Amino acid sequence: SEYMRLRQLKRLQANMGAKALYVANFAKVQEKTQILNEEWKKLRVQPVQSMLKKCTIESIFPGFASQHMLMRSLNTVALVPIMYSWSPLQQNFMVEDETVLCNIPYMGDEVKEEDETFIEELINNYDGKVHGEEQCTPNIDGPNAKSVQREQSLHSFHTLFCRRCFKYDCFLHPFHATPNVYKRKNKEIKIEPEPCGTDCFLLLEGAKEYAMLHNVEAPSPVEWTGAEESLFRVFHGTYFNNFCSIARLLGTKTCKQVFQFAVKESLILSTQVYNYQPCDHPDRPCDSTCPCIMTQNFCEKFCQCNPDCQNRFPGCRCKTQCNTKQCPCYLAVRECDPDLCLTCGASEHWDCKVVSCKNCSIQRGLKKHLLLAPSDVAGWGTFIKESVQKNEFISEYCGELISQDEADRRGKVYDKYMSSFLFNLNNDFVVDATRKGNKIRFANHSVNPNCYAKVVMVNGDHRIGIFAKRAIQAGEELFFDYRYSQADALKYVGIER
Amino acid sequence: TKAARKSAPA
Amino acid sequence: TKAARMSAPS
Amino acid sequence: NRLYFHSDTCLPLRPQEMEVDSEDEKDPEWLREKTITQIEEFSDVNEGEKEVMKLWNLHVMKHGFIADNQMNHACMLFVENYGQKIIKKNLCRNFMLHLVSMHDFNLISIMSIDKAVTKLREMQQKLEKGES
Amino acid sequence: SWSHPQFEKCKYSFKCVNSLKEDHNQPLFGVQFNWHSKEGDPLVFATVGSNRVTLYECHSQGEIRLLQSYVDADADENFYTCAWTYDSNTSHPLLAVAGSRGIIRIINPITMQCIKHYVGHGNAINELKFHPRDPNLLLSVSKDHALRLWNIQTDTLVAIFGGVEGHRDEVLSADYDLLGEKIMSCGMDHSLKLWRINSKRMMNAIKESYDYNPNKTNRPFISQKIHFPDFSTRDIHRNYVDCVRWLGDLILSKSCENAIVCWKPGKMEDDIDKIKPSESNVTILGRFDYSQCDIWYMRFSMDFWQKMLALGNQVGKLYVWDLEVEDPHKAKCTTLTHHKCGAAIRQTSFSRDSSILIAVCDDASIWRWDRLR
Ligand SMILES: C[S@@+](CC[C@H](N)C(=O)[O-])C[C@H]1O[C@@H](n2cnc3c(N)ncnc32)[C@H](O)[C@@H]1O
Ligand SMILES: [Zn+2]
Ligand SMILES: [Zn+2]
Ligand SMILES: [Zn+2]
Ligand SMILES: [Zn+2]
Ligand SMILES: [Zn+2]
Ligand SMILES: [Zn+2]
Ligand SMILES: [Zn+2]
Ligand SMILES: [Zn+2]
């Protein structure tokens, strides 16, 4: 009940430490300022002396007469356009919706009721939330390693790895709440024909028979560390009864010792586009309930459906550059899959200068060298270093990947400040090059542009590509049609050269 | 609720 | 509510 | 015919600088620091798993692997480049777990695991020979 | 004005000896005493406001004499800040000025002409600061959400502080610590961020900026792009943080909430240099309560010895606190008022000897307060 004395006790403890700190710090302050003061006494800087349009400085205290001085003009300087800070990106960076508005955007000190209303409705989009408003498996390589199950030893890898990006905790895709992704489809089951083989398990009586039975004996005494045991369960799930190899991978155990441990363990226990998300309905096939069929997307190499699924896009058998409607991938508004398109050369040329399949540009990041300079139309513009021919890929429009709600929340202040970097990708996502992006973000709007945008399905991801509408000469500024409404085009991107 | 102003109103 | 966005011909 | 500017520092471009592109980079240094600090935030993941994941992520970022067919090469390329640091940082067991996980994900074969571990051991003996 | 009753008045006392008014009648946003003035030489200060930067000389019996007067050719220029420095080689004092356009200009008052100019900032410059030990290193905070560190000897951009973990909105102020090892920055995003410049990366970048010769190379000077601060907090103030200054190892910061807070990163015991960038704790040592300072862009200042702190409010009142106390909650205050001073005080400045305190207002007036012997 009388918690007051313990709360006041902690206030008292703090107040004493604070005065002790403040005093000790003030001593340091006086010590470092004496050092700076000493360095000052060494230098002899020249005193500033007295000195078109005049200036008059009037005093308010009687006894001081008004002063006049003829104003020295400061030379004209070259001004560069406005630009807020941004970070470079060559691939979209996924971003979670914000709960609390960082701060109220400053926009003047005038008495506008409509402006005060705007601030009220901005806060309401965050739901009144504005800042300031009213257990772990121990390391197997370490000394503290436990004897653990395969599923448990691999848990972090299985959980955090992105099958699509090939990276742990990727910045693009959300976590695959289905475990079939890390379930080996084609099992590698093998047993060595001849012994490895002085300490080979095949020399043990009735051992080869047991090995073929899973997919008696003899005792021969080994001390397994917890780490050795855990590594065994991991390798056993991938190698199976190929003890010749498991022993080789352990290194710290013989083929017979590994086999004897395996036996011991065996006696235990239509205009709109929709986002793509891989399907995983392990019993029912790809039907009206499958997310892929629902969202009008093809099943991909990442889908967990049966390989002989009709919904899966098959790639192409092209012997051309895949840059015409004659290529199925191109026709479907898709970049060639490096694991399906095996005839056109999309699966190779990783170190080559020329690529044989011209339907790879986005996934390979084969963008042209863009130059930044002040625009002839508005703000900063993007200029092409070298001449490009018609329909040649120029650059992907990269940026933060945000939700439609997050886009409207951000867009609210973007449109007030009269500048936006939002670009609709699909019904689920908006690419926002405001905070992170690349040089193609400075492309201005033109009702008669030299570039065009196209959202392409590139390896299970929608990506905005910017291509040449006609042949562009070197040094030209790039423009594309923003496709705003008739009204919005006049409101925000009105200037036409 | 209210946005901070850099200068006085009138 | 809907803020301006650049768009590509679908 | 006009004065160009650097996209990073808003500073201008001397004529002799137009041959290099500031954005000819798949893995910006902020992006690399971002993966390292995000992997470190995992409370539930141990020190060894964390360190391996960071190295692997920096490796795929540097090279920009996009196809499943590149994964056998990527694993060998990883032992060749980061292999010295794996032995040094005592991470061979966690690397083997990473390899097995790639196999479970249907990205690599048993030949890949065998090859990779053989190269790691071959270069372990090479380091050992030099530390004597 | 706080929870700890102070009955004794401040030991320092001041009297108003003069008030000037510039003809342009626009807010005077900045005032700096040239602390590099040689001992015995007269006290010289500069004021920025509108498109002008004029210099003044302090004399006995409250006389303020008009030394120099400059104007930008550009009518739409509005200067906000200034910083004094000296040319190491020639020993001429230089004055750096910046404002709305986002350009830094270095003025050589000895030669009466604008020598260097730096254009690069994406928007307005809210504060300019020189490194306390390297007079060529100039720090500029900006409305573009970034801080830039420039080497004025080689005209290079040493580093840009900002990006992935930088300020989300305008950077209003920043300050180097005593020996220029770190910077503490603040802004509209209600946050204070630490940036260490004694790190291997930064020390090497400064060394390199001096070695850079454009004549002897084809490539540009690679500037460091620092996206991650060494500490960040949002738990001190609940509004735009417009002023920050180091009190040795502690921080003094203010928002538009009528208090200057004395805080430190980490728990009470935690040392500044052992602070992990993940540090989620802050400690409040004290507060300096005052009234009517509800508008943002009002800067406090200290003397050379950091013995006293001065702040002006929106109604022309000036507060001076004696920082040489045992408890920061018991700092004595002397409040200076004048019947003709009622404009918002934008900034204050003490002379290096601390004998004169100047205060500039929104009505283009200057106020001279002389410390009583
Ligand atoms: C994607 S940004 C283009 C880069 C921008 N000009 C800059 O300097 O940061 C688009 C914004 O630039 C401006 N803008 C782009 N094209 C324009 C045009 N044709 N006329 C006027 N303003 C334009 C508008 O503020 C628009 O919302
Ligand atoms: Zn991914
Ligand atoms: Zn064997
Ligand atoms: Zn399906
Ligand atoms: Zn399917
Ligand atoms: Zn599917
Ligand atoms: Zn094809
Ligand atoms: Zn194809
Ligand atoms: Zn192809």
Residue numbers in the entry:
A (entry chain A): 21 to 71, 80 to 162, 272 to 352, 425 to 429, 431 to 479, 515 to 742
B (entry chain E), C (entry chain D): 22 to 31
D (entry chain C): 562 to 693
E (entry chain B): 69 to 441
Reproduce passages from the article.
In search for constructs suitable for structural studies, we overexpressed a truncated minimally active EZH1-containing PRC2, EZH1–EED–SUZ12(VEFS), in Saccharomyces cerevisiae for crystallization. Unexpectedly, we found the majority of SUZ12 from the purified complex is phosphorylated at residue S583 according to the mass spectrometry result, likely by endogenous yeast CK2. We determined the 3.0 Å crystal structure of this minimal complex, which successfully captures residue S583 in the phosphorylated state. Upon phosphorylation, the flexible loop harboring S583 and neighboring acidic residues dramatically change conformation, becoming engaged with the SET domain of EZH1. In parallel, phosphoserine induces self-packing of the N-terminal portion of the SUZ12(VEFS), which contacts EED and the SET domain simultaneously. The core of the SUZ12 loop undergoing phosphorylation-induced conformational change is a motif of three acidic residues, D582-S583p-E584, which makes extensive interactions with one lysine residue, K684, protruding from the SET domain: both the phosphate group of S583p and the carboxyl group of D582 side chain form hydrogen bonds with the amino group of K684 side chain, whereas the carboxyl group of E584 side chain mediates an additional hydrogen bonding interaction with the main chain amine of K684. Residues H567 and S568 of the VEFS domain of SUZ12 also contact the phosphate group. Notably, residue K684 of the SET domain belongs to a single turn helix partially lining the SAM-binding pocket at the enzyme active site. We predicted that the interaction network around K684 organized by the phosphoserine may enhance PRC2 enzymatic activity by stabilizing the SET domain and facilitating SAM binding. EZH1 and EZH2 share a nearly identical SET domain, and therefore structural analysis on the EZH1-containing PRC2 here likely applies to the equivalent EZH2-containing complex.
Polycomb repressive complex 2 (PRC2) is a key epigenetic enzyme complex involved in the maintenance of cell identity during stem cell differentiation. PRC2 catalyzes methylation of histone H3 lysine 27 (H3K27); trimethylated H3K27 (H3K27me3) is a hallmark of gene silencing. The PRC2 core complex consists of four subunits: EZH2 (or its paralog EZH1) serves as the catalytic subunit; other core subunits include EED, SUZ12, and RBBP4 (or its paralog RBBP7). EZH2, EED, and the C-terminal VEFS (VRN2, EMF2, FIS2, and SU(Z)12) domain of SUZ12 (SUZ12(VEFS)) assemble into the minimally active catalytic module, whereas RBBP4 and the N-terminal region of SUZ12 are together folded into the accessory subunit-binding module, which associates with a series of developmentally regulated accessory subunits in PRC2 holo complexes, modulating chromatin binding.
